[PDB]
Amino acid sequence: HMGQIHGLSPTPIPKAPRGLSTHHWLNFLQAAYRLQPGPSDFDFQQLRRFLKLALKTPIWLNPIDYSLLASLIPKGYPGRVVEIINILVKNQVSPSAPAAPVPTPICPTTTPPPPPPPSPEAHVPPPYVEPTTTQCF
């Protein structure tokens, strides 16, 4: 009813304007608009080049998350597209589990303290004498 059954509640269709979602794309257009003063113009070309690229990877679409977009970026990508996205990432300040994308080595897991020596005595014991201890020597 008025949309797609119920009322476009589940929003199955990517709305009418199919363009990397709204707030989603806007998140990219906003930064672009924040940089050089390029109203519309034809700078979106260098952009569509990166977007269309990701399009080849329908893995971020399903989950719909630009978080995977910046990922597609081969860290070093040309154009100032990243320069615009960087404005989005910098707006992350969300450090994720800094441990996973590793082969194995990363840091030593020495959380607990080291074990004692092969002896009961360690801490500077008292001299005293006692009936048991005599020493003599």
UniProtKB/Swiss-Prot annotation:
Residue positions of motif PPXY motif: 125-128
Motif segment (PTAP/PSAP motif): 95-98
Disulfide partners: none
Segments forming a coiled coil: none
Biased composition (Pro residues): 98-122
Subcellular location: Virion
Positions of the UniProt region annotated as Disordered: 95-122
Domain of life from the UniProt record: Viruses
Posttranslational modification: Phosphorylation of the matrix protein p19 by MAPK1 seems to play a role in budding.
Record field: transmembrane: none
Residues with lipid group (N-myristoyl glycine): 3
Quaternary structure and interacting proteins, as annotated: Homodimer; further assembles as homohexamers.
Function: Matrix protein.
Protein name: Matrix protein p19
Organism: Human T-cell leukemia virus 2 (HTLV-2)
Gene: gag
